[PDB]
Each structure stands twice: as structure tokens, then as C-alpha cells.
Amino acid sequence: YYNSGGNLGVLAGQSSQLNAVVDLQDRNTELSYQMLLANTTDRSRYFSMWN
């Protein structure tokens, strides 16, 4: 799940209790990640680990 307030991921310190992950269904992580890879590496090779 990404960009979904319905199932927003949590990542905060037990003592803090204040979630550090603030997502908005307006953003698009999925696509963002894609383009990112095509700019740092050769998006033609394959890598099973990350499928």
C-alpha cells in the first residue's frame, strides 16, 4: 500500500508514538520509484531479487 490514507504505513519510536510517515493520496510513490531507477541505472538488465 502506497498513497492511501486508508492503509498508511507506520514508522515511529515507541516513546514518541508520533508516526513519521505522512502520506497523501495525491502523491504517487509507485511511478516515482520507476522513473528513479531509469535515471540511476540501466533499466534493461534484470535482477530477480527485486523482480
Partner: protein, 48 residues
């Protein structure tokens, strides 16, 4: 904005992308304490 496009025999969508600055600072003062501050400008929190 006014987009003129070719007609298609099926429902479509106009995917727009208002390139902005989606940045966030992470501050860790003490052990087991994460304080973050997001800021996407323009379009801070929707438009109204």
C-alpha cells in the same frame, strides 16, 4: 488549461503532473524519537 485531444470510443483520463517540491526533513533529537516535517509547495494540502 484546455486540452484538445483525439476522440476515443471509451472512457479515458487526463493524467496531469504539477511538478512541485515534495521535501521532508527528519530530526532525531533523542534515542527512539523521530520527528519529521513535510512540505510540498505549491499544493501544500490540496486546493480550496
Amino acid at each position: 488549461m484546455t486540452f484538445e485531444m483525439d476522440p476515443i470510443n471509451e472512457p479515458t483520463l487526463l493524467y496531469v503532473l504539477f511538478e512541485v517540491f515534495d521535501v521532508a526533513r527528519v530530526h532525531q533529537p533523542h534515542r527512539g524519537v523521530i520527528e519529521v516535517v513535510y512540505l510540498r509547495t505549491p499544493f501544500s494540502a490540496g486546493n480550496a
